[PDB]
Amino acid sequence: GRRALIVLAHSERTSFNYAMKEAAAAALKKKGWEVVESDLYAMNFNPIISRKDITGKLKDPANFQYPAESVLAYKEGHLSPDIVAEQKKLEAADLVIFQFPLQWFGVPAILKGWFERVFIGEFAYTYAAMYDKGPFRSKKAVLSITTGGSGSMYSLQGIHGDMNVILWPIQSGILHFCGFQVLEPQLTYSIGHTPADARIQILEGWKKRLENIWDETPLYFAPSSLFDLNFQAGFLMKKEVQDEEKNKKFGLSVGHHLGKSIPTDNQIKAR
Amino acid sequence: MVGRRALIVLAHSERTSFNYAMKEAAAAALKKKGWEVVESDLYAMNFNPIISRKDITGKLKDPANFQYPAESVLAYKEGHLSPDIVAEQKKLEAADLVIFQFPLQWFGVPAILKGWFERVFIGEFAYTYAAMYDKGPFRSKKAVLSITTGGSGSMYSLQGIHGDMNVILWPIQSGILHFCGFQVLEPQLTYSIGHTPADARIQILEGWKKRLENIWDETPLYFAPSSLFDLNFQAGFLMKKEVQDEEKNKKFGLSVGHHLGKSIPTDNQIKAR
Amino acid sequence: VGRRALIVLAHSERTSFNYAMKEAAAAALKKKGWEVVESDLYAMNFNPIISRKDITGKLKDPANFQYPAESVLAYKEGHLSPDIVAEQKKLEAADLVIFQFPLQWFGVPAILKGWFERVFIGEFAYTYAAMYDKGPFRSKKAVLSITTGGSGSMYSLQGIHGDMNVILWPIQSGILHFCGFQVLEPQLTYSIGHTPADARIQILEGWKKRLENIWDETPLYFAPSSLFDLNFQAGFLMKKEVQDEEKNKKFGLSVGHHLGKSIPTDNQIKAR
Amino acid sequence: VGRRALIVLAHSERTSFNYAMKEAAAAALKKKGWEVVESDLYAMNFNPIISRKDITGKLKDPANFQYPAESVLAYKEGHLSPDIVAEQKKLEAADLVIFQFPLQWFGVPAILKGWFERVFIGEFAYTYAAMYDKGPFRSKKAVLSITTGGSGSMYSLQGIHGDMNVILWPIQSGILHFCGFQVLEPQLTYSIGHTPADARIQILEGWKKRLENIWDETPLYFAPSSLFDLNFQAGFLMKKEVQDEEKNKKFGLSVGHHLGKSIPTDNQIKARK
């Protein structure tokens, strides 16, 4: 018995996004996983950070700062209960699946708000424990994305540009920052021009992948051990790691390109 | 100069914040050079950031199989979008300059600003598939990002723990603003604002107001022209085969997204050439 | 092996007579064993505006930008925008260049005008030592294929609009010959909008017939550059002894070099 | 005095002499109490390409599109793209139009060429019934202000490039006079990049001095339309009795109406009694 959380950000039960969530629950339950869901639209989830997220005494109500107040409110246990219930599902869960359509080169607004309200300091990150040292380093996360546009548009030579660049702020900035090991994303391009027989293959392919999802290699992010983790050094890359990397042709990752070339499909394929 | 309009979009809840100070300073400086200033303070408006069926107030084409792209476009052309959307679309049409003032939240825009883009930037109004990037509806307008961060600038340098800030800005500046046609100006990046002493904050404000006096004369950031690509479904919107041949031997790529497996031009998304 | 031809087309619509004239030219030329390459400017979404974005490297002086100086530096160090370079390579390869366009406001359409401005850079297409009949493209031939809505009487000597030879002069001499091209007799299709479908098909067949022997035609007469003093101190004026030889003739040399006298009949329309 | 002027400028750079000449013109005109409206085509990011996107309503025949027919229908039913309409309103208001541009390949720059093509629609700017001196703009005056890289000797009667009168003809007659404008003597500023700094200052002062009395100047001579038979059966040819009156003269009427004879000295550069 391991547990999985499936976060879904689509309003319509008639959608392929909903079909992909149902197929994931089917396949996982049948291998004996426990499955919990957050269907954000069906919950009427509130995505706006406000003062109403703290139900106790504010430290300084004349000069409100969400970072400081939310962290205090987590440690004394008076966060809004809608936030707390989501934090408990995450703690229980070993695997987290995010199922959403790509909207304006990012996550939908309602999923963005979920991250903002649920991933509070101390719970999901500290400045002492970032990246591969973060609270969620026992857990794995995977993005399941659908697009309206075709995969050629998001290739190296496409009108929109490299999909690896677009995924970087989400997979590194949000998921890995908090400690998750991030698996290869499930990219379903141009789903609205796909005939019915091909959609059935894609669903079967998804279910087949989930049977051994735990055994997969994760994506490569630069270990935090390559950097000086303190305020006086500037969180800069160590002088001896800069010397080792000077004469290599490739950079480390999409964000740590170091003025050089980006390793092919850094954010899409494991090494 | 006179007869020109500016829209200032603000995504912060608190009137005591530096983000609010930066909005007030921008309106002051712009009004004094004879601009008309219209505001969208998204928290003060109680703006609704969730796409739903309630955004269309008329007859749905197919209520059994609802698709937001198809329905929203129909609703725009027959003029029965929710009036909260229409009022924002009118400010955009009137405006020559658009300023986005927000704090960086999880390496992106706040959820409420993200929702504004989703509900207001409808097909036909803000983009068509026939008119993308530098051919888009908003090519007569200019946009600028004004961002504040909690972490210091060294953390977002080439060798910082978080990585290149140019990568982080790319999906917003290219994906959203340039896609719709905007000429995108150099972002105003105010790093580690909460750990800045009081006299330095005053300089930053004065620096912002000084820049806005001649904002219309600035060169925009470099994006790959759409003329380098075959813009139709059969070619895949790929870069033209003879432009791929001319670029094969160059050491640098074109932009952050069009790196072409090569090196990224220094500060492509932060400084104009 | 054989020879190459470039066809530049400036019309948006595939259902137009201009598009039919391009297809007919490619058909006829390919069948005589030419290699045929195209620049359909509207289908390419070609960008016709000169800007700084045309230089992709370091500008020499970004505070005081001058397109002539910067574009020439950028050509010699090889960091022009690749859309410009790809067009320059088709021109280098090409022996014959055909320009197919409708007359718009007594000139070329804006998109073709922009093509000239962005592609015909200094050093590549002209120097200063090498103007007119000494220019880089003196081994190549060019022809204008023009359509009008108005009839040919309107552009005759006594027409409301005036001599068509005057209208063609800035394009054929100012742009094409300046860079070295030998310029062939233009293909003028007057009043195409009142022509029935059977007559349009004859005009196309007439065009294809002309292209079978296009290389053997004599070019239009422009004044040789050898009649002028080619340096800054003399003002690039016509030599004093050539002014003396021409003083007592009744006709001038060309439309631009009329010399205050009569213009040779159809100087810009017919070869001698 | 209580009159309006439009200044069309076609240069990208604010550091240019073309920009200086526009600023000097606005200064001098405003000081004599003119209202001055501008079209800075590069600062507007003006779109110079005619397309179907210029008509925002229903096309008459989308299977066989013709820009002349459709644009004229779209003008009369009022669904032209608003970028076109805004420029047409400045022209309607304006009594004097000044075109400030550098000579590029013996003509106007591409962006100004496109402005003519998109803004000067049938019915608004010309009909086939009302051409030349009977056209819609016969109450207005227009003047060209041109700068060249080459020296004036090169564009003299005996210069390598040939007569400047011939080069100006398709623009001043073909575009401006065709629509009805009275055309004033062009302001020709030769070899501007090799002029010393004190001489550039004189040229500017000379320009400002000329604009003080610009309304009182005589226009250039074009052949009146009353000399021709204006109908399809006659071929719009010059009347048989006017050909008889001109048979004995040594000079022609204009650069385009040379009639196989000599061209009046500086027909397109200097006015006549």
Ligand SMILES: Cc1cc2nc3c(=O)[nH]c(=O)nc-3n(C[C@H](O)[C@H](O)[C@H](O)COP(=O)(O)OP(=O)(O)OC[C@H]3O[C@@H](n4cnc5c(N)ncnc54)[C@H](O)[C@@H]3O)c2cc1C
């Ligand atoms: C505001 C907004 C912004 C957007 N921005 C972008 C962007 O930047 N980039 C981009 O590429 N796209 C963008 N999109 C488009 C978006 O990514 C796609 O519309 C979406 O991913 C398509 O997936 P869907 O789940 O909504 O499909 P649907 O069209 O709802 O479903 C796909 C098809 O599969 C069928 N189907 C349903 N259930 C099943 C089943 N069980 N088995 C088989 N077939 C089934 C459906 O009926 C339908 O025919 C945007 C959309 C919006 C609304």
Ligand SMILES: Cc1cc2nc3c(=O)[nH]c(=O)nc-3n(C[C@H](O)[C@H](O)[C@H](O)COP(=O)(O)OP(=O)(O)OC[C@H]3O[C@@H](n4cnc5c(N)ncnc54)[C@H](O)[C@@H]3O)c2cc1C
């Ligand atoms: C959900 C969330 C996610 C975040 N994610 C990130 C992230 O990914 N990366 C990151 O780097 N940061 C992140 N942050 C931090 C965020 O960017 C900062 O908290 C924000 O930029 C601070 O800006 P502010 O306007 O709120 O400053 P405040 O703290 O509200 O104000 C700054 C200072 O200026 C003073 N001041 C106010 N008005 C004036 C005035 N008129 N003149 C002079 N001084 C004045 C204030 O009193 C204060 O001292 C996140 C924050 C949140 C809440």
Ligand SMILES: Cc1cc2nc3c(=O)[nH]c(=O)nc-3n(C[C@H](O)[C@H](O)[C@H](O)COP(=O)(O)OP(=O)(O)OC[C@H]3O[C@@H](n4cnc5c(N)ncnc54)[C@H](O)[C@@H]3O)c2cc1C
């Ligand atoms: C901005 C602008 C400015 C202009 N300025 C001027 C000007 O200064 N002077 C001037 O004289 N005119 C001017 N015009 C008019 C212009 O010259 C004409 O409209 C143009 O020459 C017509 O050419 P086309 O190929 O577009 O004709 P179309 O109308 O496209 O073609 C004519 C007919 O041929 C048919 N056809 C197409 N292919 C075939 C085929 N294979 N076989 C048989 N029939 C076929 C078409 O269906 C059509 O009915 C201007 C027009 C514009 C838009």
Ligand SMILES: Cc1cc2nc3c(=O)[nH]c(=O)nc-3n(C[C@H](O)[C@H](O)[C@H](O)COP(=O)(O)OP(=O)(O)OC[C@H]3O[C@@H](n4cnc5c(N)ncnc54)[C@H](O)[C@@H]3O)c2cc1C
């Ligand atoms: C594509 C192209 C095609 C061309 N074709 C032709 C052609 O066919 N024929 C031809 O003759 N030329 C041609 N040229 C050259 C062109 O006509 C000249 O470059 C142009 O006229 C120069 O004007 P400018 O305003 O750009 O000058 P600039 O070089 O911008 O200015 C000239 C000088 O004046 C100075 N200056 C600026 N402002 C002021 C001020 N307020 N007071 C005093 N001095 C000031 C500048 O700093 C500089 O020293 C072509 C150029 C291009 C780019």
